[PDB]
Amino acid sequence: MNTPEHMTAVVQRYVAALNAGDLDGIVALFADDATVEGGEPRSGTAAIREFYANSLKLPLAVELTQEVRAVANEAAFAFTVSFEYQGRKTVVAPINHFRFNGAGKVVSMRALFGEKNIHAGA
Amino acid sequence: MNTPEHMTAVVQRYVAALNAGDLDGIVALFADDATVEGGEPRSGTAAIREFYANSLKLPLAVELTQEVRAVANEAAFAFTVSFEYQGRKTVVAPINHFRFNGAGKVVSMRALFGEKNIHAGA
């Protein structure tokens, strides 16, 4: 229609799909003309898949850390993305913003995080 | 310049000022031409003060609940606003977004929360 309930569900599908390294599943949440920006922008179904392709090279442990804020045509959520490389666990803690269209597809995704939000040992 | 460090500090001043019901303090964080949207939009120094005036009728207990995500010219943060009315404690749990200008003043504030994020008893 769409609704808070729907948008929260999409947020949750998104998180799950990242855990499952399920590219079809992620990309299917976006409109054909959606834009994606995680930081270097990217638009359209193809560019979006490539964006998440690079993201999923290492297996991701992804987790909502608070409730989803969903209202009108937007959703925002806090979460962590954890991965390991050369024996170092890294935890990135961003806040994402979705904008939905009438159909309930994500037409805009923005990831907000800075170096202060990247947590890892030596 | 501005920096993650600066933007986080402003977020923190903002939170503190809401606790102190310090209208000068809040409003001083925004540019002369800033816009504010907490939900019904409002723009300019005067409208912005009126917005927070209504917000501070009841005393607010405001608290950052996670680290601030600050990067480039934006900051986003999760927090709670608690107030009491007719013996019922209410806790609102939004995610806010600031956009800063070159001077380091907030030129845009957006509050994201839905009915699922308003928590209170009977």
Side-chain angles (χ1 to χ4, degrees):
Chain A
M1 194 188 85
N2 57 178
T3 64
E5 282 75 17
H6 176 63
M7 297 182 180
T8 304
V10 163
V11 167
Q12 293 176 291
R13 298 175 198 163
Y14 179 68
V15 163
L18 281 165
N19 284 310
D22 173 5
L23 231 54
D24 289 6
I26 300 174
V27 177
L29 303 181
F30 296 85
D32 301 86
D33 52 318
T35 76
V36 159
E37 166 199 333
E40 309 273 299
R42 254 152 293 195
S43 167
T45 306
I48 291 176
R49 197 181 179 100
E50 189 193 346
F51 175 85
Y52 284 102
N54 318 300
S55 307
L56 288 167
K57 279 292 177 181
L58 290 180
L60 304 184
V62 185
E63 199 195 346
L64 282 191
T65 53
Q66 284 185 355
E67 66 198 60
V68 177
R69 336 289 138 118
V71 66
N73 284 319
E74 314 176 37
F77 55 104
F79 65 113
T80 48
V81 178
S82 298
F83 55 95
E84 179 148 348
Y85 187 62
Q86 311 292 344
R88 172 178 64 173
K89 300 196 174 190
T90 292
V91 183
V92 193
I95 292 179
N96 275 4
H97 175 277
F98 283 175
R99 226 244 305 157
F100 294 80
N101 64 33
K105 308 176 189 185
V106 179
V107 298
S108 113
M109 180 276 192
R110 314 180 60 191
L112 205 43
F113 67 111
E115 289 182 29
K116 273 284 174 177
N117 310 119
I118 302 181
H119 308 278
Chain B
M1 194 188 85
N2 57 178
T3 64
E5 282 75 17
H6 176 63
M7 297 182 180
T8 304
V10 163
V11 167
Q12 293 176 291
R13 298 175 198 163
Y14 179 68
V15 163
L18 281 165
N19 284 310
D22 173 5
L23 231 54
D24 289 6
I26 300 174
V27 177
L29 303 181
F30 296 85
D32 301 86
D33 52 318
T35 76
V36 159
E37 166 199 333
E40 309 273 299
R42 254 152 293 195
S43 167
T45 306
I48 291 176
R49 197 181 179 100
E50 189 193 346
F51 175 85
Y52 284 102
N54 318 300
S55 307
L56 288 167
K57 279 292 177 181
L58 290 180
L60 304 184
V62 185
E63 199 195 346
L64 282 191
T65 53
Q66 284 185 355
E67 66 198 60
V68 177
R69 336 289 138 118
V71 66
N73 284 319
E74 314 176 37
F77 55 104
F79 65 113
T80 48
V81 178
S82 298
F83 55 95
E84 179 148 348
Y85 187 62
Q86 311 292 344
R88 172 178 64 173
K89 300 196 174 190
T90 292
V91 183
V92 193
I95 292 179
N96 275 4
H97 175 277
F98 283 175
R99 226 244 305 157
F100 294 80
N101 64 33
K105 308 176 189 185
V106 179
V107 298
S108 113
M109 180 276 192
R110 314 180 60 191
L112 205 43
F113 67 111
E115 289 182 29
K116 273 284 174 177
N117 310 119
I118 302 181
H119 308 278

